[PDB]
C-alpha cells in the first residue's frame, strides 16, 4: 500500500525542478504510468517556461525578499503554498504557477550551492498538492487532466 499518485506527482515535479535548475534532461526511465508522466512533464516544459518568463520580475521580487538560504527556508515556503489555495479555489493555472515558482527557486538554490535543497523543495510542493488537493486532482483524472487542460489542438475545425 504505497501512494501511487504522490509517487507519480513527485517524479514529474522533481524532474522539472531539477532540469530547470541545471539544464540537464534526466535519462532515467519514467516507470509506472510513465506515459502520462512523460506527457505531463513535456506539458510542464512548454507552459512552465512561459510562466517564468512572463512573470520574471514578480518571481525575482519574491525570491529576493524571501531570502532562501537553506533547507529550513524551503520548509518555510510550504506556508506560502498553503495560502495560495486557502480561498477554496483549485485550478491548473495555480498549480502550474506554484510549480513554476518552485523551478525559479530551484535555479536560485543551484547558484548558491544548495542543490541538496531542490529535492526537499519538490517534495514539499508535491506534499501540499497531492495530500491536500487529492480529491480535486482525482476529479480531473490526475495528470491526464493536466495534459488535456493545456492541450492546444491543430484541427481545421
Amino acid at each position: 500500500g504505497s501512494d501511487e499518485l504522490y509517487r507519480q506527482s513527485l517524479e514529474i515535479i522533481s524532474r522539472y525542478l531539477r532540469e530547470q535548475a541545471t539544464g540537464a534532461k534526466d535519462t532515467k526511465p519514467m516507470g509506472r504510468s510513465g506515459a502520462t508522466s512523460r506527457k505531463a512533464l513535456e506539458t510542464l516544459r512548454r507552459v512552465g517556461d512561459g510562466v517564468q518568463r512572463n512573470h520574471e520580475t514578480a518571481f525575482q521580487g519574491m525570491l529576493r525578499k524571501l531570502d532562501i538560504k537553506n533547507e529550513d527556508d524551503v520548509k518555510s515556503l510550504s506556508r506560502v503554498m498553503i495560502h495560495v489555495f486557502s480561498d477554496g479555489v483549485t485550478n491548473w493555472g495555480r498549480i502550474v504557477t506554484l510549480i513554476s515558482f518552485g523551478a525559479f527557486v530551484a535555479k536560485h538554490l543551484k547558484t548558491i550551492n544548495q542543490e541538496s535543497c531542490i529535492e526537499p523543495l519538490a517534495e514539499s510542493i508535491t506534499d501540499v498538492l497531492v495530500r491536500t488537493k487529492r480529491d480535486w486532482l482525482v476529479k480531473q483524472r490526475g495528470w491526464d487532466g493536466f495534459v488535456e487542460f493545456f492541450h492546444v489542438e491543430d484541427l481545421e475545425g
Binding site: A58, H83, V84, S86, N91, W92, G93, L98
Partner: peptide
C-alpha cells in the same frame, strides 16, 4: 496580515490569470 499571505496572493493572481488563458 502575515507576509506569507501577501506572497500567496501574488501567486494566486498570476495563477488565476494564467488559468483564464486556457480554461474553456
Amino acid at each position: 496580515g502575515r507576509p506569507e499571505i501577501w506572497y500567496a496572493q501574488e501567486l494566486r493572481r498570476i495563477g488565476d490569470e494564467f488559468n483564464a488563458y486556457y480554461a474553456r
